[PDB]
Amino acid sequence: AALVIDNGSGMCKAGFAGDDAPRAVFPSIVGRPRHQGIMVGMGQKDSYVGDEAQSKRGILTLRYPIEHGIVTNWDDMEKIWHHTFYNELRVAPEEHPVLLTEAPMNPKSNREKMTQIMFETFNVPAFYVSIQAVLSLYSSGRTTGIVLDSGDGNTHVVPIYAGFSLPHAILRIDLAGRDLTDYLMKILSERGYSFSTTAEREIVRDIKEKLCYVALDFEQEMQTAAQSSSIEKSYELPDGQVITIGNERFRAPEALFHPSVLGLESAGIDQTTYNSIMKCDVDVRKELYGNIVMSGGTTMFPGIAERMQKEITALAPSSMKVKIIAPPERKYSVWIGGSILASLTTFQQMWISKQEYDESGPSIV
Amino acid sequence: TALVCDNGSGLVKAGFAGDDAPRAVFPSIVGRPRHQGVMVGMGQKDSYVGDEAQSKRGILTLKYPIEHGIITNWDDMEKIWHHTFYNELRVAPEEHPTLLTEAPLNPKANREKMTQIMFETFNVPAMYVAIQAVLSLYASGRTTGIVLDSGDGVTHNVPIYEGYALPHAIMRLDLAGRDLTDYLMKILTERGYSFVTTAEREIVRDIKEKLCYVALDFENEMATAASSSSLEKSYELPDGQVITIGNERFRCPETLFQPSFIGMESAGIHETTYNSIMKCDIDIRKDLYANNVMSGGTTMYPGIADRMQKEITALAPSTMKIKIIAPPERKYSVWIGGSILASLSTFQQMWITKQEYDEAGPSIV
Amino acid sequence: TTALVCDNGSGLVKAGFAGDDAPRAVFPSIVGRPRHQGVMVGMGQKDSYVGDEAQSKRGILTLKYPIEGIITNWDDMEKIWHHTFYNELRVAPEEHPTLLTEAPLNPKANREKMTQIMFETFNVPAMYVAIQAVLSLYASGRTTGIVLDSGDGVTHNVPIYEGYALPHAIMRLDLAGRDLTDYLMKILTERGYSFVTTAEREIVRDIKEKLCYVALDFENEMATAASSSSLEKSYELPDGQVITIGNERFRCPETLFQPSFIGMESAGIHETTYNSIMKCDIDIRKDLYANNVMSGGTTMYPGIADRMQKEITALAPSTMKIKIIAPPERKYSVWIGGSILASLSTFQQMWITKQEY
């Protein structure tokens, strides 16, 4: 079988071809000690990656080696792959077709650095890099669709048509899953809280993924949350105390549509989808309007799909069938789209041979 | 039965002898690569032809084998016939006698090339080449009449008498269905808004085929535009931009009466009918004035008949009554009268056979 | 006192006084009207801003360009025009005859309201509004010819004879300067870059000025670029990295001739020129063909002239002298015309004074 590894700027997702759900699910973090010891509690390995690094973040120095879906630090990237094989999946790369990802608007050198390391250190027999969005469309069941692959680090909007992405309109916004939490960190603090350190900030992260929601109208809900305790949500902090979280529950999602609250010189995710359709040709626009693949964990907060449907029919023509497509498995969308693609008997001929790499180099992708 | 084909400059109509409506109508479009390559899901196809080429665009040149009523590219024209037989009509050429139609002035070199190919590249058991305006007259129910076949690349004035074209009066003006479109585009961009955009060809010819009309009096009308919104007709483009077009709505189809509106120098179709009907004998001029039939594509427009009549009333001495017959089927007539003629029994001994071709070669046509 | 001239397009206004041969206030005709409650990283919060500071304001003020080759937004136009006579030109309207230019096809309804506003909201003692490219041919020292006027928003062909651009043949094409930047932007984006915000976009436009060209033949150029490094013209990006670009350099403005690169089929600048010369009658054609004249921010592109020498000849019957004249001044020639024309003693009795109105 093959391997499929979505190298996510928060969470990476490895596994084999053909499986439905990712086999190695892990944060892309490399932990290296301030000073290596010899024993547990001091730190005895030169590198601890992901979940082990997370429990051990005191002696370690944590870093997330991938920023906006561009790997900044290729040392730590290799370190992550080396983990995934022997430590996680419990496999050996030279035995394996490996399929990895890249975020659209990834530069040549950045690909080529990766494409080399897989075929020079890891000596894998077959390797394919792929475009996170075209893989999301393949998980959707389409040749054509505009795709808000709003990740944790990077929100990329892609208008795909007949398998090709029109990068032509791939507009990017620089807020996404992380930028959301760190707004909620500010605004819970405003409601008399102390969330500052990682432990406390991760409490903010969990509040976000559980209790939060995107209002269908920002006004009706401000007025209501200033009055009825229906919006109020109780939360058990792991120390013992139940607290209640209030209007922050929607105003923190509303950063996506009004970046202004963060103080970002951008327009909302919705407005960008419109500009990404309008920056395409008149014919394809009707399908893009009907085939908005919502994808990724950022597009998971309650009300968000329905909210996008609303604002986008008002941006779109009075004659338009806007339709959001929203998978429940959107958090691993790119991975399932990859899984199918790796497993495809047809697509087998696109498996870049170890030979053609050794004659053509990394530029062929 | 046998098969019949109106090869337009941009609309090939096909089918059999004995049906009153064309079995296949596709644009004469030939799509060739902008580089050898692929589109995802398909492979590399030999070429494109017709709707398939058009409805995608992107990857191709989009040429045409026929321009101005004459066949200019040949390889492409053969590819189209390949797409007419197996692909459109679902037949093999060798079983079915074929009729195809030419321009009234069409070169003897062209006709020899055409009847060559049909019995060599295709090997059809019998063929006929027929003559565009003349066949339309047959479909119009008349032996005799000066027809005005404005196809896609030209109008054609032809003094038909007793089932025969009179050559020395066969007028032809290089401005029609095609030159009339692109002009309508630029004039809406002159007006208000960017009417420029690739798909907006088909959008702004749909406008041409509806909102356009040949103003009955240009001088009155250009002023009436400046008086009343009466002329202004709105159009929602697929994006929902409810635009409105006004004086240009006529200012385009009027090109046929005033060629200066695109940029041909020639006096207009009224005068080209007058100056052909003059190249006839004084005697056959009355019948021509009573059986004057408009044919082809560009004859669609609201007003184009009465405009002709009025114009030829200025041009005619007081006595001579001009009578224009606008056909209900007009864009198809040249197919229609071909089929009906090809099914007319006796005509079985009035085809060109495979045999007299293997003997006489192209010189029979 | 002396008169004033203010040329308006979708991008750069030029304002100034008559007499001088060189425009005074050239700025982005951008207003920024408050979007919501926001505060600048610098300034406190205040209302609508015109010009360069609005570009630096981008996220607190919604940014309009009041002119899309025609005046779309009326209050916004006035907003600029106060900022013109006052903040730019440092004078007052009551003392000052003023000429505003305009894009040729401008609807009557615009013109009537344009006259009103400036006599009323502003109160200039007399004024004029005037057909852009006619003032380009005039700044070109000609009684005849055809200007191809193309800049930040709209592109034009005006076949002029003895005072008049032939109206019906003034061909327009809305593919022009922003269309070029936003293409050049998308190309580099596809390669793994992304601008969006404020600085980086503007950088991409500066690249358009330095690296871009239209080559005579696009297929021979398409080849050499992809073949050999000659064309690989670098630039030093504000982060550090050299973006090398060879094909894209010429590829970007090719949209003027082959617009289909972005997605446009309506007739290219060349074909519009053939068809305006034709869209007239037939004799004057020669000294249209022999005085194809370029003006406006886009015609700045190198190579463009040699290319049109091909691009018209291809269709024009053999014995027509095709000649493409392009001034070095070109981006301002509508003002440079308008100053000299405003200053004309002969033209004094055509200054519509506040009494006739």
Side-chain angles (χ1 to χ4, degrees), chain A residues 105-108 167-168 170-172 264-267 279 281, chain C residues 35 40 57-59 182 186 189-194 197 262:
Chain A
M105 299 58 252
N106 200 54
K108 277 176 53 48
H168 192 170
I170 297 176
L171 298 173
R172 189 183 116 191
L264 185 64
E265 309 231 306
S266 197
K279 212 156 178 291
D281 200 354
Chain C
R35 67 197 282 211
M40 226 312 106
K57 300 320 201 199
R58 273 194 184 186
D182 305 350
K186 51 123 282 172
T189 306
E190 307 192 353
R191 303 163 87 233
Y193 298 100
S194 182
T197 11
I262 67 174

PDB file of all heavy atoms in Angstrom, chain A residues 105-108 167-168 170-172 264-267 279 281, chain C residues 35 40 57-59 182 186 189-194 197 262:
ATOM      1  N   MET A 105       0.120  28.071  -3.688  1.00  0.00           N
ATOM      2  CA  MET A 105       1.078  29.129  -3.388  1.00  0.00           C
ATOM      3  C   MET A 105       2.186  28.602  -2.479  1.00  0.00           C
ATOM      4  O   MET A 105       2.571  29.201  -1.471  1.00  0.00           O
ATOM      5  CB  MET A 105       0.492  30.449  -2.820  1.00  0.00           C
ATOM      6  CG  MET A 105      -0.492  31.214  -3.685  1.00  0.00           C
ATOM      7  SD  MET A 105      -1.950  30.258  -4.164  1.00  0.00           S
ATOM      8  CE  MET A 105      -1.592  29.991  -5.874  1.00  0.00           C
ATOM      9  N   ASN A 106       2.738  27.465  -2.903  1.00  0.00           N
ATOM     10  CA  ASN A 106       3.988  26.994  -2.346  1.00  0.00           C
ATOM     11  C   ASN A 106       5.022  27.186  -3.451  1.00  0.00           C
ATOM     12  O   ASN A 106       4.770  26.742  -4.584  1.00  0.00           O
ATOM     13  CB  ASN A 106       3.874  25.532  -1.945  1.00  0.00           C
ATOM     14  CG  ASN A 106       4.928  25.093  -0.940  1.00  0.00           C
ATOM     15  OD1 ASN A 106       5.100  25.693   0.120  1.00  0.00           O
ATOM     16  ND2 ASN A 106       5.637  24.012  -1.236  1.00  0.00           N
ATOM     17  N   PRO A 107       6.154  27.855  -3.158  1.00  0.00           N
ATOM     18  CA  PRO A 107       7.235  28.164  -4.094  1.00  0.00           C
ATOM     19  C   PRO A 107       8.072  26.957  -4.492  1.00  0.00           C
ATOM     20  O   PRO A 107       8.173  25.971  -3.757  1.00  0.00           O
ATOM     21  CB  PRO A 107       8.111  29.136  -3.326  1.00  0.00           C
ATOM     22  CG  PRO A 107       7.226  29.698  -2.249  1.00  0.00           C
ATOM     23  CD  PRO A 107       6.426  28.475  -1.864  1.00  0.00           C
ATOM     24  N   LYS A 108       8.792  27.079  -5.612  1.00  0.00           N
ATOM     25  CA  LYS A 108       9.459  25.956  -6.262  1.00  0.00           C
ATOM     26  C   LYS A 108      10.500  25.254  -5.408  1.00  0.00           C
ATOM     27  O   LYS A 108      10.518  24.031  -5.257  1.00  0.00           O
ATOM     28  CB  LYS A 108      10.137  26.431  -7.538  1.00  0.00           C
ATOM     29  CG  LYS A 108       9.214  26.511  -8.741  1.00  0.00           C
ATOM     30  CD  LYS A 108       9.910  27.094  -9.973  1.00  0.00           C
ATOM     31  CE  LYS A 108      11.224  26.420 -10.393  1.00  0.00           C
ATOM     32  NZ  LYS A 108      11.112  24.972 -10.433  1.00  0.00           N
ATOM     33  N   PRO A 167      -5.387  29.346 -10.204  1.00  0.00           N
ATOM     34  CA  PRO A 167      -4.667  30.068  -9.170  1.00  0.00           C
ATOM     35  C   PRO A 167      -4.693  31.570  -9.402  1.00  0.00           C
ATOM     36  O   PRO A 167      -4.522  32.356  -8.480  1.00  0.00           O
ATOM     37  CB  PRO A 167      -3.290  29.444  -9.223  1.00  0.00           C
ATOM     38  CG  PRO A 167      -3.382  28.284 -10.185  1.00  0.00           C
ATOM     39  CD  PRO A 167      -4.423  28.805 -11.153  1.00  0.00           C
ATOM     40  N   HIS A 168      -4.862  31.966 -10.659  1.00  0.00           N
ATOM     41  CA  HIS A 168      -5.737  33.026 -11.127  1.00  0.00           C
ATOM     42  C   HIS A 168      -6.616  33.754 -10.104  1.00  0.00           C
ATOM     43  O   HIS A 168      -6.714  34.998 -10.149  1.00  0.00           O
ATOM     44  CB  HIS A 168      -6.533  32.342 -12.246  1.00  0.00           C
ATOM     45  CG  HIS A 168      -7.375  33.165 -13.205  1.00  0.00           C
ATOM     46  ND1 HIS A 168      -7.943  32.711 -14.318  1.00  0.00           N
ATOM     47  CD2 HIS A 168      -7.815  34.445 -13.005  1.00  0.00           C
ATOM     48  CE1 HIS A 168      -8.747  33.643 -14.758  1.00  0.00           C
ATOM     49  NE2 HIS A 168      -8.677  34.669 -13.946  1.00  0.00           N
ATOM     50  N   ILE A 170      -6.568  32.456  -6.581  1.00  0.00           N
ATOM     51  CA  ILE A 170      -6.318  31.882  -5.263  1.00  0.00           C
ATOM     52  C   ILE A 170      -5.881  33.022  -4.367  1.00  0.00           C
ATOM     53  O   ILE A 170      -4.757  33.525  -4.375  1.00  0.00           O
ATOM     54  CB  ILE A 170      -5.334  30.692  -5.190  1.00  0.00           C
ATOM     55  CG1 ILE A 170      -5.855  29.500  -5.975  1.00  0.00           C
ATOM     56  CG2 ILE A 170      -5.143  30.260  -3.730  1.00  0.00           C
ATOM     57  CD1 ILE A 170      -4.887  28.296  -6.028  1.00  0.00           C
ATOM     58  N   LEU A 171      -6.922  33.520  -3.732  1.00  0.00           N
ATOM     59  CA  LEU A 171      -6.787  34.537  -2.724  1.00  0.00           C
ATOM     60  C   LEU A 171      -6.716  33.854  -1.375  1.00  0.00           C
ATOM     61  O   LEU A 171      -7.341  32.833  -1.088  1.00  0.00           O
ATOM     62  CB  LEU A 171      -7.945  35.515  -2.811  1.00  0.00           C
ATOM     63  CG  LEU A 171      -8.094  36.319  -4.099  1.00  0.00           C
ATOM     64  CD1 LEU A 171      -9.388  37.101  -4.069  1.00  0.00           C
ATOM     65  CD2 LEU A 171      -6.909  37.246  -4.320  1.00  0.00           C
ATOM     66  N   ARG A 172      -5.811  34.437  -0.602  1.00  0.00           N
ATOM     67  CA  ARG A 172      -5.419  33.961   0.711  1.00  0.00           C
ATOM     68  C   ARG A 172      -5.815  35.055   1.697  1.00  0.00           C
ATOM     69  O   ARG A 172      -5.786  36.234   1.353  1.00  0.00           O
ATOM     70  CB  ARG A 172      -3.895  33.793   0.677  1.00  0.00           C
ATOM     71  CG  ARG A 172      -3.215  33.110   1.856  1.00  0.00           C
ATOM     72  CD  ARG A 172      -1.700  33.113   1.641  1.00  0.00           C
ATOM     73  NE  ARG A 172      -1.041  33.914   2.659  1.00  0.00           N
ATOM     74  CZ  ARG A 172       0.249  34.278   2.622  1.00  0.00           C
ATOM     75  NH1 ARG A 172       1.077  33.922   1.631  1.00  0.00           N
ATOM     76  NH2 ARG A 172       0.701  34.989   3.657  1.00  0.00           N
ATOM     77  N   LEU A 264      -7.139  43.696  11.468  1.00  0.00           N
ATOM     78  CA  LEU A 264      -6.498  43.256  10.245  1.00  0.00           C
ATOM     79  C   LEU A 264      -7.065  43.977   9.029  1.00  0.00           C
ATOM     80  O   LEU A 264      -8.279  44.137   8.865  1.00  0.00           O
ATOM     81  CB  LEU A 264      -6.674  41.747  10.113  1.00  0.00           C
ATOM     82  CG  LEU A 264      -5.994  40.988   8.979  1.00  0.00           C
ATOM     83  CD1 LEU A 264      -4.478  41.051   9.099  1.00  0.00           C
ATOM     84  CD2 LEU A 264      -6.454  39.544   8.992  1.00  0.00           C
ATOM     85  N   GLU A 265      -6.166  44.440   8.167  1.00  0.00           N
ATOM     86  CA  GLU A 265      -6.538  45.097   6.927  1.00  0.00           C
ATOM     87  C   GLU A 265      -6.923  44.051   5.883  1.00  0.00           C
ATOM     88  O   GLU A 265      -6.267  43.846   4.868  1.00  0.00           O
ATOM     89  CB  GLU A 265      -5.389  45.986   6.444  1.00  0.00           C
ATOM     90  CG  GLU A 265      -4.859  46.931   7.521  1.00  0.00           C
ATOM     91  CD  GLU A 265      -4.754  48.388   7.103  1.00  0.00           C
ATOM     92  OE1 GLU A 265      -4.130  48.690   6.087  1.00  0.00           O
ATOM     93  OE2 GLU A 265      -5.324  49.225   7.803  1.00  0.00           O
ATOM     94  N   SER A 266      -8.010  43.337   6.161  1.00  0.00           N
ATOM     95  CA  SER A 266      -8.533  42.338   5.248  1.00  0.00           C
ATOM     96  C   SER A 266     -10.051  42.499   5.302  1.00  0.00           C
ATOM     97  O   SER A 266     -10.616  43.362   6.005  1.00  0.00           O
ATOM     98  CB  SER A 266      -8.064  40.915   5.644  1.00  0.00           C
ATOM     99  OG  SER A 266      -8.194  39.932   4.617  1.00  0.00           O
ATOM    100  N   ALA A 267     -10.622  41.793   4.330  1.00  0.00           N
ATOM    101  CA  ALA A 267     -12.052  41.562   4.250  1.00  0.00           C
ATOM    102  C   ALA A 267     -12.313  40.104   4.613  1.00  0.00           C
ATOM    103  O   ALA A 267     -11.358  39.317   4.720  1.00  0.00           O
ATOM    104  CB  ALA A 267     -12.498  41.778   2.814  1.00  0.00           C
ATOM    105  N   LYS A 279     -12.870  36.942  -9.879  1.00  0.00           N
ATOM    106  CA  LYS A 279     -11.596  36.880 -10.584  1.00  0.00           C
ATOM    107  C   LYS A 279     -11.485  35.685 -11.536  1.00  0.00           C
ATOM    108  O   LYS A 279     -10.518  35.545 -12.283  1.00  0.00           O
ATOM    109  CB  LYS A 279     -10.457  36.943  -9.581  1.00  0.00           C
ATOM    110  CG  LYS A 279      -9.224  37.624 -10.138  1.00  0.00           C
ATOM    111  CD  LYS A 279      -8.404  38.178  -8.988  1.00  0.00           C
ATOM    112  CE  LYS A 279      -7.130  38.819  -9.508  1.00  0.00           C
ATOM    113  NZ  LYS A 279      -6.249  37.793 -10.014  1.00  0.00           N
ATOM    114  N   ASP A 281     -13.553  33.345 -14.870  1.00  0.00           N
ATOM    115  CA  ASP A 281     -14.333  33.627 -16.073  1.00  0.00           C
ATOM    116  C   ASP A 281     -15.821  33.330 -15.860  1.00  0.00           C
ATOM    117  O   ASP A 281     -16.205  32.448 -15.079  1.00  0.00           O
ATOM    118  CB  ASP A 281     -13.753  32.812 -17.257  1.00  0.00           C
ATOM    119  CG  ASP A 281     -14.065  33.270 -18.690  1.00  0.00           C
ATOM    120  OD1 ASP A 281     -14.846  34.199 -18.901  1.00  0.00           O
ATOM    121  OD2 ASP A 281     -13.516  32.702 -19.639  1.00  0.00           O
TER     122      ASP A 281
ATOM    123  N   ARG C  35     -15.400  52.654   7.066  1.00  0.00           N
ATOM    124  CA  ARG C  35     -16.112  51.394   6.922  1.00  0.00           C
ATOM    125  C   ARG C  35     -16.932  51.058   8.157  1.00  0.00           C
ATOM    126  O   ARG C  35     -18.077  50.624   8.035  1.00  0.00           O
ATOM    127  CB  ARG C  35     -15.174  50.224   6.535  1.00  0.00           C
ATOM    128  CG  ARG C  35     -14.132  49.732   7.540  1.00  0.00           C
ATOM    129  CD  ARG C  35     -13.027  48.878   6.912  1.00  0.00           C
ATOM    130  NE  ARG C  35     -13.315  47.479   6.585  1.00  0.00           N
ATOM    131  CZ  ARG C  35     -12.334  46.558   6.636  1.00  0.00           C
ATOM    132  NH1 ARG C  35     -11.138  46.851   7.144  1.00  0.00           N
ATOM    133  NH2 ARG C  35     -12.510  45.353   6.090  1.00  0.00           N
ATOM    134  N   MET C  40      -6.475  54.208  13.130  1.00  0.00           N
ATOM    135  CA  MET C  40      -5.255  54.000  12.374  1.00  0.00           C
ATOM    136  C   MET C  40      -4.093  53.668  13.286  1.00  0.00           C
ATOM    137  O   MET C  40      -4.024  54.058  14.454  1.00  0.00           O
ATOM    138  CB  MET C  40      -4.854  55.199  11.543  1.00  0.00           C
ATOM    139  CG  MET C  40      -4.462  54.807  10.127  1.00  0.00           C
ATOM    140  SD  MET C  40      -3.316  53.430   9.877  1.00  0.00           S
ATOM    141  CE  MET C  40      -4.435  52.190   9.283  1.00  0.00           C
ATOM    142  N   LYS C  57      -4.225  53.994   5.032  1.00  0.00           N
ATOM    143  CA  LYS C  57      -5.379  53.762   5.913  1.00  0.00           C
ATOM    144  C   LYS C  57      -6.183  52.478   5.710  1.00  0.00           C
ATOM    145  O   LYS C  57      -7.079  52.172   6.508  1.00  0.00           O
ATOM    146  CB  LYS C  57      -6.438  54.870   5.835  1.00  0.00           C
ATOM    147  CG  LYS C  57      -6.142  56.321   6.166  1.00  0.00           C
ATOM    148  CD  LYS C  57      -5.233  56.490   7.351  1.00  0.00           C
ATOM    149  CE  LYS C  57      -5.407  57.871   7.925  1.00  0.00           C
ATOM    150  NZ  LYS C  57      -4.283  58.231   8.751  1.00  0.00           N
ATOM    151  N   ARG C  58      -5.885  51.800   4.585  1.00  0.00           N
ATOM    152  CA  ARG C  58      -6.679  50.720   3.970  1.00  0.00           C
ATOM    153  C   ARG C  58      -7.726  49.932   4.743  1.00  0.00           C
ATOM    154  O   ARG C  58      -8.775  49.568   4.213  1.00  0.00           O
ATOM    155  CB  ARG C  58      -5.813  49.683   3.216  1.00  0.00           C
ATOM    156  CG  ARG C  58      -5.527  50.046   1.762  1.00  0.00           C
ATOM    157  CD  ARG C  58      -4.958  48.954   0.835  1.00  0.00           C
ATOM    158  NE  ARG C  58      -4.690  49.585  -0.453  1.00  0.00           N
ATOM    159  CZ  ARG C  58      -4.302  48.985  -1.586  1.00  0.00           C
ATOM    160  NH1 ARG C  58      -3.932  47.689  -1.669  1.00  0.00           N
ATOM    161  NH2 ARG C  58      -4.276  49.775  -2.669  1.00  0.00           N
ATOM    162  N   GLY C  59      -7.492  49.607   6.006  1.00  0.00           N
ATOM    163  CA  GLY C  59      -8.415  48.826   6.809  1.00  0.00           C
ATOM    164  C   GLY C  59      -9.370  49.642   7.668  1.00  0.00           C
ATOM    165  O   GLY C  59     -10.234  49.048   8.311  1.00  0.00           O
ATOM    166  N   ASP C 182      -3.409  43.216 -12.006  1.00  0.00           N
ATOM    167  CA  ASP C 182      -4.083  42.149 -11.298  1.00  0.00           C
ATOM    168  C   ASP C 182      -3.861  40.812 -11.982  1.00  0.00           C
ATOM    169  O   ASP C 182      -3.947  39.744 -11.354  1.00  0.00           O
ATOM    170  CB  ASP C 182      -5.557  42.523 -11.151  1.00  0.00           C
ATOM    171  CG  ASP C 182      -5.823  43.881 -10.490  1.00  0.00           C
ATOM    172  OD1 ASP C 182      -4.911  44.520  -9.947  1.00  0.00           O
ATOM    173  OD2 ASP C 182      -6.963  44.320 -10.525  1.00  0.00           O
ATOM    174  N   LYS C 186      -1.745  37.875 -10.237  1.00  0.00           N
ATOM    175  CA  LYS C 186      -2.152  36.474 -10.174  1.00  0.00           C
ATOM    176  C   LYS C 186      -1.098  35.479 -10.631  1.00  0.00           C
ATOM    177  O   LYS C 186      -0.965  34.433  -9.994  1.00  0.00           O
ATOM    178  CB  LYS C 186      -3.516  36.160 -10.802  1.00  0.00           C
ATOM    179  CG  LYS C 186      -3.842  36.617 -12.219  1.00  0.00           C
ATOM    180  CD  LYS C 186      -4.230  35.482 -13.152  1.00  0.00           C
ATOM    181  CE  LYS C 186      -2.988  34.749 -13.614  1.00  0.00           C
ATOM    182  NZ  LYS C 186      -3.268  33.535 -14.349  1.00  0.00           N
ATOM    183  N   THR C 189       1.373  34.967  -7.953  1.00  0.00           N
ATOM    184  CA  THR C 189       0.680  34.260  -6.887  1.00  0.00           C
ATOM    185  C   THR C 189       0.725  32.744  -7.118  1.00  0.00           C
ATOM    186  O   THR C 189       1.083  31.976  -6.216  1.00  0.00           O
ATOM    187  CB  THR C 189      -0.772  34.810  -6.771  1.00  0.00           C
ATOM    188  OG1 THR C 189      -0.699  36.229  -6.607  1.00  0.00           O
ATOM    189  CG2 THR C 189      -1.552  34.217  -5.611  1.00  0.00           C
ATOM    190  N   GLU C 190       0.475  32.318  -8.373  1.00  0.00           N
ATOM    191  CA  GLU C 190       0.406  30.906  -8.778  1.00  0.00           C
ATOM    192  C   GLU C 190       1.718  30.172  -8.521  1.00  0.00           C
ATOM    193  O   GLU C 190       1.799  28.978  -8.231  1.00  0.00           O
ATOM    194  CB  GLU C 190       0.085  30.762 -10.281  1.00  0.00           C
ATOM    195  CG  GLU C 190      -1.159  31.504 -10.795  1.00  0.00           C
ATOM    196  CD  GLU C 190      -1.687  31.178 -12.192  1.00  0.00           C
ATOM    197  OE1 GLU C 190      -1.061  30.428 -12.945  1.00  0.00           O
ATOM    198  OE2 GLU C 190      -2.757  31.697 -12.540  1.00  0.00           O
ATOM    199  N   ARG C 191       2.773  30.976  -8.600  1.00  0.00           N
ATOM    200  CA  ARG C 191       4.130  30.508  -8.413  1.00  0.00           C
ATOM    201  C   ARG C 191       4.448  30.339  -6.934  1.00  0.00           C
ATOM    202  O   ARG C 191       5.551  29.902  -6.612  1.00  0.00           O
ATOM    203  CB  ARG C 191       5.098  31.509  -9.035  1.00  0.00           C
ATOM    204  CG  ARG C 191       4.832  31.758 -10.510  1.00  0.00           C
ATOM    205  CD  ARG C 191       5.522  33.031 -10.963  1.00  0.00           C
ATOM    206  NE  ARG C 191       6.897  32.828 -11.380  1.00  0.00           N
ATOM    207  CZ  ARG C 191       7.918  33.538 -10.886  1.00  0.00           C
ATOM    208  NH1 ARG C 191       7.774  34.364  -9.843  1.00  0.00           N
ATOM    209  NH2 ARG C 191       9.099  33.416 -11.473  1.00  0.00           N
ATOM    210  N   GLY C 192       3.548  30.665  -6.012  1.00  0.00           N
ATOM    211  CA  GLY C 192       3.878  30.571  -4.611  1.00  0.00           C
ATOM    212  C   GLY C 192       4.275  31.883  -3.987  1.00  0.00           C
ATOM    213  O   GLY C 192       5.315  31.960  -3.344  1.00  0.00           O
ATOM    214  N   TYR C 193       3.505  32.942  -4.209  1.00  0.00           N
ATOM    215  CA  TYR C 193       3.700  34.225  -3.533  1.00  0.00           C
ATOM    216  C   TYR C 193       2.299  34.744  -3.244  1.00  0.00           C
ATOM    217  O   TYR C 193       1.358  34.038  -3.618  1.00  0.00           O
ATOM    218  CB  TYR C 193       4.458  35.228  -4.421  1.00  0.00           C
ATOM    219  CG  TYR C 193       5.867  34.777  -4.782  1.00  0.00           C
ATOM    220  CD1 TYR C 193       6.111  34.211  -6.036  1.00  0.00           C
ATOM    221  CD2 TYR C 193       6.884  34.809  -3.821  1.00  0.00           C
ATOM    222  CE1 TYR C 193       7.338  33.608  -6.306  1.00  0.00           C
ATOM    223  CE2 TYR C 193       8.115  34.209  -4.089  1.00  0.00           C
ATOM    224  CZ  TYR C 193       8.325  33.595  -5.323  1.00  0.00           C
ATOM    225  OH  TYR C 193       9.512  32.952  -5.591  1.00  0.00           O
ATOM    226  N   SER C 194       2.074  35.910  -2.620  1.00  0.00           N
ATOM    227  CA  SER C 194       0.733  36.436  -2.375  1.00  0.00           C
ATOM    228  C   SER C 194       0.880  37.812  -1.750  1.00  0.00           C
ATOM    229  O   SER C 194       1.667  38.006  -0.822  1.00  0.00           O
ATOM    230  CB  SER C 194      -0.105  35.528  -1.462  1.00  0.00           C
ATOM    231  OG  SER C 194      -1.431  36.004  -1.258  1.00  0.00           O
ATOM    232  N   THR C 197      -2.620  42.712   0.593  1.00  0.00           N
ATOM    233  CA  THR C 197      -2.654  43.861   1.492  1.00  0.00           C
ATOM    234  C   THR C 197      -2.400  45.254   0.904  1.00  0.00           C
ATOM    235  O   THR C 197      -3.277  45.834   0.242  1.00  0.00           O
ATOM    236  CB  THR C 197      -1.751  43.586   2.736  1.00  0.00           C
ATOM    237  OG1 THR C 197      -0.969  42.406   2.512  1.00  0.00           O
ATOM    238  CG2 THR C 197      -2.600  43.433   3.987  1.00  0.00           C
ATOM    239  N   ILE C 262      -6.371  36.666 -19.589  1.00  0.00           N
ATOM    240  CA  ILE C 262      -7.208  36.830 -18.411  1.00  0.00           C
ATOM    241  C   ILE C 262      -8.579  36.236 -18.680  1.00  0.00           C
ATOM    242  O   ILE C 262      -9.159  35.603 -17.794  1.00  0.00           O
ATOM    243  CB  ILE C 262      -7.339  38.281 -17.861  1.00  0.00           C
ATOM    244  CG1 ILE C 262      -8.068  39.283 -18.744  1.00  0.00           C
ATOM    245  CG2 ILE C 262      -5.963  38.810 -17.542  1.00  0.00           C
ATOM    246  CD1 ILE C 262      -8.289  40.655 -18.068  1.00  0.00           C
TER     247      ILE C 262
END
